[PDB]
Every structure is written in structure tokens, then in C-alpha cells.
Design an enzyme around this catalytic site. Structure first.
Site, PDB file in Angstrom:
ATOM      1  N   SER A 173       0.863  -1.192   0.000  1.00  0.00           N
ATOM      2  CA  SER A 173       0.000   0.000   0.000  1.00  0.00           C
ATOM      3  C   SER A 173       0.892   1.232   0.000  1.00  0.00           C
ATOM      4  O   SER A 173       1.659   1.424  -0.963  1.00  0.00           O
ATOM      5  CB  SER A 173      -0.993  -0.073   1.169  1.00  0.00           C
ATOM      6  OG  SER A 173      -1.796  -1.250   1.150  1.00  0.00           O
TER       7      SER A 173
ATOM      8  N   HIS B  77      -6.901  -9.526   1.452  1.00  0.00           N
ATOM      9  CA  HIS B  77      -7.662 -10.028   2.596  1.00  0.00           C
ATOM     10  C   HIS B  77      -8.565 -11.190   2.184  1.00  0.00           C
ATOM     11  O   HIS B  77      -9.665 -11.359   2.724  1.00  0.00           O
ATOM     12  CB  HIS B  77      -8.493  -8.921   3.255  1.00  0.00           C
ATOM     13  CG  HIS B  77      -7.805  -7.593   3.301  1.00  0.00           C
ATOM     14  ND1 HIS B  77      -6.584  -7.408   3.913  1.00  0.00           N
ATOM     15  CD2 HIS B  77      -8.166  -6.384   2.809  1.00  0.00           C
ATOM     16  CE1 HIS B  77      -6.224  -6.142   3.800  1.00  0.00           C
ATOM     17  NE2 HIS B  77      -7.166  -5.499   3.136  1.00  0.00           N
TER      18      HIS B  77
END
Lengths: 599, 586, 583
Positions: B445, B560
């Protein structure tokens, strides 16, 4: 006739692949008709064409190829991915010759009739050989990268092929020409290291012509004809400042459109060329310059085949739907299916420092004021002009004045006209389009200067974004397959690594170049856009990734500019690909809904 | 036989520790095995025992106690609301859905399915309660069960700007607070009139620490005063699968229990209507990742850098999940660095032995999160395979006060990059076993943004791994599902304004890609909506054009995935690619 | 390496030889490969060439010429009616399955069934239900003027009548009350011929040719004590084999007939008298079509695989596909009170003793003889001597030869078989008297069961589609309500008759069986229910006689029905495995 809508498309049948018989007396071709379009083979001996096959499932039948003795058609059938079929013309049904999971493509008979070459991924595609007299299949050659153009030697000893020799050359979009004899290992025949297709072996069995450009020239250079002898090349279509092939816009091309040059005798090579919004047939001569063969300056020859005994082709104009011809005789009745009257364009010119540019205005019936739609063709190195565009005729049929032009950057007006936009998209091309549009408004008083729109696809979408970011004059805009951010395009497009290098001399991964790409990016100026904009884009677009449209959508939305974003799950050219017209109908529906809302 | 990514498959993952109304029991979710499936577990004070079992689908989640303590509602996977009697018998299917909450009187269960629906318990009937135009955020029942407070925006535009208000919705919606800002975690006060919320008032950008606000008659006053730290767990760790409730709970009329991130740790604290913040259960070396509470008991999940997450009830551990960890865990050592804002900190996790080991600079995402005292299986596995793991909290991190957050505002790639390289050099000086000639830089990220930035500004690293990276801040603004707001909040820049876009280009790692020489592994999900894969495509294409050794792993599964579906394939393949790349270059 | 059952897969099978209206072409069906699929073939006098090429389903069948000779209708496989222009182009699909397409002679219509009778208007391209029968439609032929069709319909007693059905905008035409098929309308549009037997005749009576005029009948094929149609054994007939009589002129009716193990073409003439037309006493014409301009047929012998002919010229090369050498049988006779009986012995190569296999044909009213039998050639190729004969009860030797077994199966028919087999051992010294087997299907399975229960002389037995209990057969078989009444004059539902049926039942004598027996049977058999085989299996098993019971999920004639050769291959494997185990 009833009131025309996008549905008018469904009245049409689409011809393709006009294949003249060896004796020159017949034409076999492909017709796609109705909901889903499916294609079947048709045949004419001079009169009205008759169907030979009929498809009820799948995409249908394509790629008809005459056996040299004129008694059989090989073809490809999709119903069964893409199977090589063999059809006797004097009676009986076709036989399936190949049984591959993934099908074949590009069948070509050897001139002696003994073999059929084709490519397949079986279960990059490999070149296979069908032994006709033995009814046996055999892998001929497995290329490292893949096989481009392919043509048989006239003596059937083997084929000429174009390919990149390794991934290094392949990554530069460079190829060479090889000799591949019949199996019992390809030798290189030309150190080309550049673009090549449309191999035309000379009747003498040794020399051959190719279409492309030498190594030193970028891909904005006109494709030309080069004669190859003993590894040496010389330009063949001399004194002819125009590209080989059809690069004129038109939206009624469904299927394959063969354009391979053909030797009419030992001195004469027949080819098609784009000249000021038209495509004509010309002859190049070993012993001289280029001569016109069949060139209507108001028409487009979109495909042709030929031999020493006859010629077949597909012809169209701005006012005539594509028709199949055999030796000058029309054998189809396809324009008669066009379900509403067509109108005749009026020419409007504009000045540039390189000389006069041209465009056209298509007006609806009547004399009342009508909205004016500036349409920008893609490419940028194509032409508007004398191809048939169902969309433009429909626009006028629904009451819009359609204005469409060939700004500098267009392809049919000489190399210098192409080169004028190099490295500086959004300068002279935007000038020419807006100058042309003003000349339309001055020349045609019924064009309503208060109800104008700008629209285009691909480079036309880049240009629509650019223009709406530099003037608020338009009341509506439609940007299709657009570019908004030249930097991200370089990294996301499957041609991004080379397109800006060829078109602009810029490399997005080099810092100084990237800043110039950003200065050419319509997104830099998006804060100026006030024009309500319809955005049309395919979700799976590989050439122009949808990220380009997402950025324009998000930017306009942030400024609260009225904006609508249509995301197609079908990729562009779905009609030609699968026969499903849904993308075309929905796109035209969205276009008119947007214009009705704002104009 | 050094451990590999397969070691993950030995673990079971706890989540959602729900204390019973009587404070004497805990129900929670455990995901175990290839595919992870979740079932409900229960403890009455001792070792937890399973309540449900699942061989198909994702399993069971969101256990919710009935106020009388005799039933558990829960969600079963399309996604059905189920009702399980606790004293014997199998569950009944009542209604996919999500977010079940009992009314305090036990008469109703609210859930969303999105519209808010209402299940009448005593009548066994379903009813649509409210169908929002835009959507429902946080939801809590008033203590007298007359209805719920809900959070929602006024239109689609205000939602993209993260501006919300709180509404009153009685049993079968009036606006109750002109908040016009971020709000969640509604905690109604026992008096049935006031309520607390987590967020920030309207004037504050979203880089401001989330805090606790007491709402009374449309007025707000900050409750967690004298405490310059955000509410909630914002500490990194990779063993959180499922839901981790953190809603504040009133322990009495004066005391609001909440969790907060402090210098790489997460503790429980209490806010008091008449005073500041007091510690309730805060180990500065541990992380409390989820909790529930009432006047009678507290249940939570606890972990550290050396202890796998365990479930607790009233201070007693009721699970044995750390015992499943299949190789020895190692202890990090703290290493500091200096800044104009004071001392920064990071940690080094070393393998066994005394030989030189390669040094891996890992950069946490966010940027407003902390590394520290969460349990990171990836870091333990890295050390088990012979790598020195260096991980730190540069300026921009979240647990060291608002000024530490604000230091990077508008200028990513200045002092945050300084702090990471400063910290890394201090690691090399303080830990002699770190091999200065075999270094790598990596992160996800914002850490992928920073890996791209750093390798474009120094060639010192021998390998780089950039995950979910950002390379072009301009295109991110137009493609990200948070793009209309993210650069405005984080940088004060608007990608749709010309002058701002140029500044975004100057902050883009892609501008400096021509300087990258470090062999780079690129990891990205094809379907990423928060960080579109176009970001990675540009870095891949640019490195390839420069003939920098580069490898691009394109996952079809979104991030995720383990929490989403229970499938560990994404986690295993990513770790495989990471170590393979580090093995190739060191 | 000795050839095995797989040799079948080398063969392609012809059927349905359709002569063109002008008599100059033949269109026919060829089934080839694993699964057989059929396609249309065409010959104009020379080597036949393929017309269609099926890759899925059963393939294309039932080619029918348009009267103008420019089109073939056909059925494509659910089963769509197709229309193929012969001078170029691919076929058009006409319907949405169907069977039995027949053009009207004027070319305006195509009749077919789909079961109800439907009508396709050619000039209008429209379909229309013509007639939905309560019970069903048998034979069907157009009147020569295309005004309509004659149909046969009723049923469990096999009694039918003939109806006139004109074109829509059925009246009964003959109170026949008996078996009828092969309607052949006379050119005059008024009289018509049929194949069958009048009401008074039991179904063991030879089928004959009858001219129908104003509701009256006269036998046409007089002075010819032989049945109409092919009733000769052979195992290479896959598909349809048309045998409908055809008027060559107003006086001449062409038909096929079974004569002493052969099938020939003959002509009957109005006023009577039968003449040979094309009859080789050593060959079998299994199918034919004809008109005033030409004849096409399929021909075979004991040594020649079926071939298609057009006007005496062979147009196929199918025998060349036979993958091992064929051998020639030798004739062996035996004596009976009705005269000389005959059979054949097919021997392997070489000079050593070989096992002797007595094979018994079904029916019982069929012939062995001059059909091509792949199974028999394969047996000889694998080292067995094949003995096969036509005992009394056989059909090609006159009515009296048929009638000799009436009411007493297991008497003179068993005598004739063992008599013949003994003559084989005497006349053919290479037959090994210590390695003998007995085997047969249908009535041949009954007879294998009967024989092994009355003598222990055989070292192995193979009983296929057998009958063991005549009583239960009467109640379970879909022909049980009539079969024993016609064949034996016994009614299983009458007490005294049932006891006689039990005395004719091989199961009564099963306690005498010592011969290792292979039992082969289809589980779904409707004509001969599997209970027949279950009882024989259980009885032999109770006596601990070596026994093996193969239960096929596919019904008999699976190859011709669906094209799957699995039943044929598996059955032959089991036959040879059993003979290898016991000799």
C-alpha cells in the site's frame, strides 16, 4: 420507410472476403445476416449470388478458398471452434478435415492443389500442412514468436513467412522474411528488421514484393510496396505519396477484408491505396511508376482478389452500402436492404499552412435549423471520406447535421500531412478541426451554432477530451475509447511501450519525456471542462485501458460536470468478432439519448 | 527443514470475542482448516469448546447473545440468520444478511440485507425496517429498545467526501446530529438520551486522530481529552481473520471503555464524563485487537510481537492457539533514530545463530498505522528462514501523536523517506549481524508507494518487493474508489485541478523510475478497487523498458482473501514469491 | 497374431440402396467408424463417393430421391428431415424426430411419421399432421397418382387391415384381418399387391404375394413354395434393408424370396407364374429398389461381404476392407423322411484337428446358408470348425419342411441337428470329436438348452437369448400371447396346454445338464424376457454345473440401432473366452 433508429442496422447483411475463382469466372464470398449475425458462404458466376452454406448455430462459415482446379472450396466453420472444411462445388456436403480443440485459421492452398497450409494451437500457433492427395495432417513449423504474413511460392515448393526471430526483435515490432520449403528448417531471405505483411511472390518464383516500411522509418511512415531480390529491396510504388491498403472510415465491414497485392503479369502488381478519403486499385510496375487501375475518387474498394483471369472486390461510397463485384459486375443487392434514404454530403474546405484541408457536411431533410455534430475520426492516421457510415446517415435521418473532416494527421493527403502532428497532438490537429467546424457553421446557415456537439473514438476521444478542456463552445460531448492521461496509457496499454515513441518521440518511463506527455494530456486541463460529456468504453479494452475513461469520469464528477459513463462488457468490434450487434445498438442508443437530452 | 509459508496452515484464527450479558461466558469465532472455515466457540471460564461445525461454505460468524443469555444469534454461510439454543438442540434458520444486533429487551433482532430489516422474536416474523437511498453505516439500539441510531450520508457526493450524520430511527428517520464528518461506533448512554461516537468533527481532515465525542442535544464535546492518540487498533499484524469489534461500551453512567493505539501498542482505556483518560488494560508491549464489555464482564483478544492472538474472559485466557505455532518465535530488539520531532523507534528481528544475515527493510502501509507489538507470522517466518527483519514507525505513523502524523502532510517522500533510511542505517550500525551488502526494501500500500519512491532515489538496495503499490498519484485519484478524497485529505491536492496535478506528478514515484536499478518483484491484485492494478502496470512497464530485472505477480484474488473466503492461496503464493525473489538476489 | 473381435471395426456397412427415378444412379447409406456413424453415398455407375459426413449422432439415413432426380430427402441425427440438392450446395433442414420419409410420385409432398403421420407440402414449405392413429401405422405407400396413401393398421394376434387415406383438404379398403406389409400399388392406380398370408393361415405359413382387387385377393407368386423376403442369416446388415415389391410394368411384379439358404429376385406375373429374375443359389440379395428404368441392390455370399450394385455393376469396394482372409465352406448333407437336408462346415487353415462348433440358427423359420457371417469367418480364423445347418423347421425348403416341427419342438429338429453334426464329424476328419460345442441364439438357445439337457456329448455350450420355460415365456414375452398358439397350437393359459408346454421346456430336463454353459442375454429383452436366462442360470448353478451369465444392458441389434459395436465386440469376446476355457 419507417422512422429510423439504431435498429435500422438489423435490416442489413454484411459482405466480406470476395474470393475470385482461379478461372476468373466466379466469386465466392462471405455474407453475415440475421438476434445474432451468422455468416454463410455465397457464390456467383456473374448473376445474383446464391447461398452455398447456411449456419444455424455459432458464428458460421468464413474464409472460402478455391482449390486451384476450381472444383472445391476450403473454408473455416464455427458452430466446433474453427474447423477446416472441404466443400465440393458440383454436389455433396462439406467434409471436416481438421479435429483440433482450438481450431485453425488462415487456410491457403498451394498453387498446385497438393497442400493446404493453416495455423493452429492444436490440442504461439504453429504452421500445419494438409496433404490433399494423402488426406494427412502434419505440423510444418513451430515458430518461436508467431507467424505473420504467409504466401506460397508460385511453384508450390514452400512458403514465404514473416516472423520475429526472438522476443528481442518481437518486442521492437520488427520482423524478417524467411523461406520455408515443404518438409521432407527456414532460411532467412531478407534482413528487414521492420514491419512487413502482404507478401506477393513474383511469378518468376524468385523475387517477391512486400507491404511495409524499411527499418529507419517510424510506423507513421506510409506503408509502401518493396520489391525484394537477392536480399535487396527497392521501393516499387514510386511517385505515389499514399499508403497501401484501406484506411478510410466506415462501419459496415463485418468479417475479413483481403487486400493482398497480386501480380497481373511479370511487370504489374495490383494493390489498393488510400487517397484523400477514397481507396482505389492501382498497379505498381517493375519498369515504371504507379498507374490507376480502378480508382473512383468518391468510392472505397475495401477488399479485392485477383489473378490473370479475373478480379472480385467489395465496393462502397458515402452513399452506397458495400456490394460484391465480379469483373465489374455487381453480384449482390445489399444496398437495397438499407431501410431509409441516404443523403449526399457537401464538401467544406479549410486552410492550413500545408495547404487546403477538407471535410463534409451531411444535412437532414428540410430547411429548418438543425444541431451540428463535429465528429472526429480515430487513428489519427486514417481518413474520413467515401466509406459508408451507417451511423452518419442515421444521425442525419434523425435530424442532426454531421460535420466530419480530415485534419492534419489524416492519412490520405501525403506523408507531410501525416507528419504535421508528430510530437504535438493538440496543436495543429485541434486547430484544423475547430477551423473546419467554423467553416461548416459559416457555409451552412441552417447549422445551429447554439446546438453543437463534439464526439469521436480512440484518437477522436483524446481529441474530444482535449477540445472540451480548451473551449466551452460545445453544448454536448461524447468521448469514446478515449485517452485522458498519456503517462498512464504508456504503462497500461498493450501498445503503450511503442505508441508514444512512434507518434510523439516520447518514452513515458523517461522523466523529461513524461512531463511532455503530461502536457499533452487532456486530463491536465480537465478543470476547464463545462460540457456535458457521455463517456463510452469497454471494460476489457487492452489497447486503450478503461483507466483512461475512469480518470475523465472521476475528474468531471468532481467538478460536478454532467457526465455519464457507459461501460461495455463486450470489447470493440464485437459485431465482426461474434456477430452480436448488442454493443453497436446500445452505443448508438446512448449517443442519441445524450444528444436528445442536451441539443 | 526450515519452515516455509505452509507453516500458516498450522494456525487457527480467533475473532469476534463476545462476552455474555451475565459477564460469565465468551462466545467467539474460530477459523480452522485446503480452506479455512469458521465455527462458533464458547467458554464458561475454562478452555473453549466448539459449538458449531462447518464443512461447506465460509462457516458461521457474528455470534450475538440474547439478553436473557439463553440463545446465540449468528450468521451462517448464502448468509442466513440462525438462532442456536445454548442449553441443548441444534440451531433454527430464521431468515444473505449481515450485522445482527439484538434489541436490549430481547424482542427484536436488527440486521441488514442494503436495507435494514427487523426480525420480531416473539412473533417469528420478518419486516423491512428502512431502505436507505445511499446506505447505513454504524447502528446501535437505544437502551430502552425504542429504535436505533444510524449513520448515513445525504447523497452520493457527500459519501465520497466521507461526510455523514447521525439519525434517529424508532421502531415501526429524523436527523439527530449535523455532524457532516466521519462517524462510527455509536455507543448510546445508559440514560437513553445521550450517545458517544468515534470520529472527528466537520472542520477536521481525515488525517486527524479519531476521538471520542459525547453527543447531547446536537452538541458535541470531546471525551477522551489529554490523550493524543487515536481510538481503535491501527497496529500491523497478519493473524486477524474475521471481525474485530471495538465499539466503546459504557461501564457505568460515567465510564466509557475504549481501545486506542499508542506507540505500536493497543490498550484499553476509560473516558470519564468529568475528566480525562485513565488506563484500563494497557500493555505497551501488546495489542488488544478486539473487545466486548458490559457492567458484568469483559472479553477480548490479546497478542504481542511474540504471542499469537488468544481469547480472554475477565483476564483468563480461554484458548490455546499460540501452542499451534509450528516453529519457535523470536524476540525483536528495539532500535531508535532521531528526528526534529523527537525520537523515532523501530525493531529488528534476527534469526538464530551468529552469522551475517540479509537485512530486509519492511515499510508498513497506511501511512497512518504503526508497526510494533502485533503478531506478524510473515516476520517470524522471515527470521526463521535466515533474514534480518527491520521495521519501524517513521513520521507519518499514527501512534506517536498528531504532530508525528502531520509531519508528512502534503509531502510524501520527504521526511518519511528520510526516517526510513535513517532508521535502516541505525539498524546496520546497532546490529552487526545485518549484512550491509545484502539489503532489500519492501512494503504494501503506502509501503509500496515508498518502496517505489526509495528505489527511484537510491540504488543501495539489492532487491525490492513492492506490494499493492502506488506509482502515479494522478491516475490513482481517478481510478481509486477513494480517489475523490484521498489526496485532498492526505496532501491537500486535487487531481482534477491543473496546478495540483503537477504537484501530484512531482510526488509520483513513476516520475523518477528512470533511476531505478534494483531488481523488483511487483505484487498486485487484478481486481483491486482501493489501489487499481494500473498503478502496478505502470511500474512494471517502466522497469521493463529500462531492462531492470522485474517480476509482476497478478493475483485474481483481492486482498484479505483469507478473511473474505477462508482461502489461504493468496497468502501462501505471495509469501512463496517473496522468498523466491529474496533467494534469487538476497 | 490371430484376428479377434476387433476385426469388426475394419468394416463399413452398406444399407438402403435407392435407385434414382431415371435408373442411372444409386444413393445409399454407409456406416463406418469407437462408434459407427452413417452417411449418404452416391454412384452414377462408377465408384461411389460420399455425399454427407456425419461426426456426431447416428448420422444420416433414409435417402429418398425427388421424382425429378435433383434432390435427396433424408433423415439426420434427434432426427430431422433434410433436403439436399444434388447439383451443388449443402442440405436444408425442413423439420424440427421423424422417420420413414416417402415422396409422393408427383413430387408435391413428402410423407413421414413423428407416432402420427405428417405431411410436408413441398411447393408451400409447410408441415401438417395428416393422421394420428389410435394404435399405429404399419406399411405405407403412395398411390401412383399421389391422391393419398394406403396404410396398414389394426394387434397382439398380428391381424391387420388395409386402409385408403386421401390427401387432406381413412376408409377401410380390405378386410384382411391378418399379417400384411409391403404394399405395392399397381400402376393403374386401382389394384395393389401386398405381402402376407390370408386370415385362415397361421404365421408359420410362408409369406406370399397377393394382388388386391375390389376387396378380393388372389395369390400372385404361385408355383413357388418359398417365402417372400430375406430370411437368411448373416451378421453384416446394419441399417434399413428395403424389400418392397416393385411393378416393372403392368404385368410384372419384382420381389425377393428365400430359397434354400439363398435370397434371389423373382418376378410374379398377373395371372400367376413365378420366374427367376436375378437368383444365385449361392448368394443373398438382402435389399433392392427398382422402377421401370433400373435396379439397385445389395449382394453378398458366404465368402463375399455385402456390396452395393446398380444395374449389375458393383459400385462399392467394401469386401476389400475385410481384414483377414475369408474361407470357403464345404457342404455336408443328411437324410430325413422329407428328403435331403443340408448344412456347411467352415474350417480353419492348416491340416490339424480343430474343435467342432455346432451353431444353431434362430427363428426357427429362417435359413443358414449364403449370407456373409463375420462371426463364422472369425471363428475359423481363430482355429474352430464351424458347423451350421438347416434342420426341419427351417424356412427355405418348402412349407412341409417348416410344418414338420409344428407342435413338437425338440423332436425332429433336434434329431436333424445331431444327425447333421454326426455327418460333419464323419465327412470332415479334421473335426475333433472330443472338442465339440453347441451354441445358438433365440430358438437356437432353446435348442442348445434342449440338447444339453438330453445328451452330455458336448464339451461346451453357449446359449444366447435362450428360452428355458415355455410357460412363463407365454406370459412375459411381448409376443407370448400368440407365439405358442401359432408355433405349437398351445395356449399357456389353458391347463392341459400348459403341461404340454412344460414338457417342451428345457428347464424340465436341466437335471441332466453337465456341459459348461455360457449364458448371454439382454436385461431389457422384450421378445425373450431375461427371466428365461435367469432360470437356466439358477438351475445350472444349483447343480454346480460350470456356468457364466452375461447380462447385457444393451438390447439386441444395438449396432444397427445406435451404431455402438460394444455389444457385438463384448459378446464375441465372451464367446471366445468360454471356448478357450473349455474347448
Amino acid at each position: 420507410t419507417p422512422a429510423p433508429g439504431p435498429d435500422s442496422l438489423l435490416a442489413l447483411a454484411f459482405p466480406s472476403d470476395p474470393q475470385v475463382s482461379p478461372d476468373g469466372k466466379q466469386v465466392a464470398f462471405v455474407l453475415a445476416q440475421i438476434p445474432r449475425y451468422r455468416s454463410g458462404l455465397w457464390l456467383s458466376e456473374g448473376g445474383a449470388a446464391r447461398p452455398l452454406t447456411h449456419a444455424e448455430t455459432g458464428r458460421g462459415d468464413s474464409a472460402p478458398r478455391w482449390s486451384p482446379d476450381g472444383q472445391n472450396l476450403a473454408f473455416v466453420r464455427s458452430a466446433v471452434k474453427a474447423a477446416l472444411m472441404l466443400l465440393p462445388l458440383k454436389g455433396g456436403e462439406a467434409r471436416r478435415v481438421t479435429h483440433f480443440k482450438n481450431g485453425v485459421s488462415g487456410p491457403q492452398w498451394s498453387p498446385d492443389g497438393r497442400f493446404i497450409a493453416f495455423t493452429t494451437t492444436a490440442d504461439p500457433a504453429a504452421l500445419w500442412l494438409y496433404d490433399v492427395e494423402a488426406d494427412k495432417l502434419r505440423e510444418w513449423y513451430a515458430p518461436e514468436i508467431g507467424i505473420g504474413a504467409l504466401s506460397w511460392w508460385p511453384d508450390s515448393r514452400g512458403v514465404l513467412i514473416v516472423q520475429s526471430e526472438d522476443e528481442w526483435q518481437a518486442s521492437q515490432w520488427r520482423q524478417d522474411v524467411y523461406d520455408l520449403p515443404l518438409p521432407t528448417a527456414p532460411q532467412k531471405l531478407l534482413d528487414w528488421n521492420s514491419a512487413a505483411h502482404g507478401l506477393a511472390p513474383h511469378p518468376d518464383g524468385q523475387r517477391f514484393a512486400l507491404i511495409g516500411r524499411p527499418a529507419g522509418k517510424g510506423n507513421t511512415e506510409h506503408a509502401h510496396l518493396y520489391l525484394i531480390e537477392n536480399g535487396q529491396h527497392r521501393r516499387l510504388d514510386t511517385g505515389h505519396d499514399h499508403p497501401v491498403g484501406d484506411a478510410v472510415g466506415g462501419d459496415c465491414h463485418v468479417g475479413a477484408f483481403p487486400e493482398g497485392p497480386r501480380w497481373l503479369d511479370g511487370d504489374t502488381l495490383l494493390f489498393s491505396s488510400t487517397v484523400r478519403g477514397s481507396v482505389g486499385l492501382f498497379t505498381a510496375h517493375i519498369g515504371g511508376g504507379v498507374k490507376a487501375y480502378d480508382h473512383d475518387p468518391q468510392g472505397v474498394i475495401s477488399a479485392f482478389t485477383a489473378n490473370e483471369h479475373g478480379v472480385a472486390l467489395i465496393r462502397e461510397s458515402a452513399t452506397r452500402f458495400p456490394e460484391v463485384e465480379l469483373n465489374g459486375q455487381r453480384v449482390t443487392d445489399l444496398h437495397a436492404r438499407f431501410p431509409f434514404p441516404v443523403r449526399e454530403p457537401q464538401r467544406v474546405t479549410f486552410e492550413t499552412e500545408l495547404g487546403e484541408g477538407e471535410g463534409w457536411v451531411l444535412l437532414p431533410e428540410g430547411e429548418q435549423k438543425v444541431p451540428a455534430l463535429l465528429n472526429i475520426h480515430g487513428g489519427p492516421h486514417t481518413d474520413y471520406g467515401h466509406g459508408f457510415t451507417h451511423e452518419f446517415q442515421l444521425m442525419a435521418a434523425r435530424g442532426y447535421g454531421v460535420c466530419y473532416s480530415n485534419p492534419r494527421g489524416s492519412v490520405g493527403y501525403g506523408q507531410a500531412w501525416v507528419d504535421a502532428i508528430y510530437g504535438r497532438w493538440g496543436t495543429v490537429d485541434a486547430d484544423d478541426l475547430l477551423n473546419f467546424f467554423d467553416r461548416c457553421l459559416e457555409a451552412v446557415p441552417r447549422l445551429d451554432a447554439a446546438k453543437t456537439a463534439v464526439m469521436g473514438g480512440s484518437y477522436g476521444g483524446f481529441m474530444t477530451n482535449w477540445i472540451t478542456g480548451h473551449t466551452t463552445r460545445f453544448q454536448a460531448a461524447i468521448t469514446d475509447r478515449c485517452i485522458s492521461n498519456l503517462i498512464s496509457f504508456g504503462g497500461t496499454s498493450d501498445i503503450g511501450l511503442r505508441f508514444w515513441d512512434d507518434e510523439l518521440g516520447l518514452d513515458f518511463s523517461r522523466r523529461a519525456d513524461a512531463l511532455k506527455l503530461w502536457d499533452l494530456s487532456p486530463l491536465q486541463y480537465v478543470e476547464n471542462v463545462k460540457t456535458p460529456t457521455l463517456i463510452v468504453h469497454s471494460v476489457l479494452d487492452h489497447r486503450c485501458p478503461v483507466e483512461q475513461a475512469e480518470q475523465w469520469y472521476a475528474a468531471l464528477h468532481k467538478h460536478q460536470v454532467p457526465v455519464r459513463f457507459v461501460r461495455f462488457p463486450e470489447e470493440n468490434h464485437e459485431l465482426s468478432r461474434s456477430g452480436r450487434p448488442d454493443r453497436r445498438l446500445t452505443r448508438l442508443n446512448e449517443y442519441f439519448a445524450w444528444l436528445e437530452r442536451w441539443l
